[PDB]
Amino acid sequence: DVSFRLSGADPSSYGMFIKDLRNALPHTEKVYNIPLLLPSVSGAGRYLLMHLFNYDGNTITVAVDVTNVYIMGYLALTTSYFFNEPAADLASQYVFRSARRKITLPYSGNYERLQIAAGKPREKIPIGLPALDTAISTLLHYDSTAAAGALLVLIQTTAEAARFKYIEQQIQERAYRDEVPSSATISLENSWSGLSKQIQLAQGNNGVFRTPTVLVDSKGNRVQITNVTSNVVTSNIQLLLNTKNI
Ligand SMILES: *[C@@H]1O[C@H](CO)[C@@H](O)[C@H](O)[C@H]1NC(C)=O
Numbered sequence: 001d002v003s004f005r006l007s008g009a010d011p012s013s014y015g016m017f018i019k020d021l022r023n024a025l026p027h028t029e030k031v032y033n034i035p036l037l038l039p040s041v042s043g044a045g046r047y048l049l050m051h052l053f054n055y056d057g058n059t060i061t062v063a064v065d066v067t068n069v070y071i072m073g074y075l076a077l078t079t080s081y082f083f084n085e086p087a088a089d090l091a092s093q094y095v096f097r098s099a100r101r102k103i104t105l106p107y108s109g110n111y112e113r114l115q116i117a118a119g120k121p122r123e124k125i126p127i128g129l130p131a132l133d134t135a136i137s138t139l140l141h142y143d144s145t146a147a148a149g150a151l152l153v154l155i156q157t158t159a160e161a162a163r164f165k166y167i168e169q170q171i172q173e174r175a176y177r178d179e180v181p182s183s184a185t186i187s188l189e190n191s192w193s194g195l196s197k198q199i200q201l202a203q204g205n206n207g208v209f210r211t212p213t214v215l216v217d218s219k220g221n222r223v224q225i226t227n228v229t230s231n232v233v234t235s236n237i238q239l240l241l242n243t244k245n246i
């Protein structure tokens, strides 16, 4: 398990959380020195628990699928909550079985359904450490519309930060003042799968991508990534989704 406390949190402590989160995902190889997540894991071993503590010290435990960094669901006091999707339903057979009731959320976990449920896209939702604190607090008590916004925060500040150094740095820059994600951040989130694939297909093709990936950069300019020398590959992405899952 890994843990993060908002009480006394700073850019360093957050960075040590995100490092512990990355280190908790198993891999047996690296591809261009980036950890390759496993094709699958059977049983309870598929799921990492993240223990998150709000500023007053209340906690939720969040289950994460180690093969893709997807949030399956969470436990808040004696109630478990799972996404309305078959991967989470399967995950509920292994984690949080000690909950006194299990609620299935009225949406699946993907960004588009979450944004619908929230009433807004995540371009308009501030992230950062204060927002994470707020998110944890929201999830303590069921409200499905509020929880959608909170989960959008939680996913970006945990899983998305683990996947990309840039996003981790964005959040560190937002330790004491929330701000909506930069459009680069949104672009990386949306491209994780495709980047992961193209980095794996570059092995066998002289480091060249089969199909270029289009990103939005830090200045807001639209840029093509065509090979493993790009900074996104050498100095940013930290975890590759296995092509067996794409
Ligand atoms: C690889 O990408 C770099 C920029 O990251 C670019 O200058 C170069 O032309 C590209 N080479 C190939 C073969 O794609």
Ligand SMILES: OC[C@H]1O[C@H](O)[C@H](O)[C@@H]1O
Residues within 6 Å of the ligand: 069, 070, 071, 109, 110, 111, 112, 155, 159, 160
């Ligand atoms: O479509 C968004 C997906 O990527 C993010 O990681 C969320 O967990 C979600 O499953």
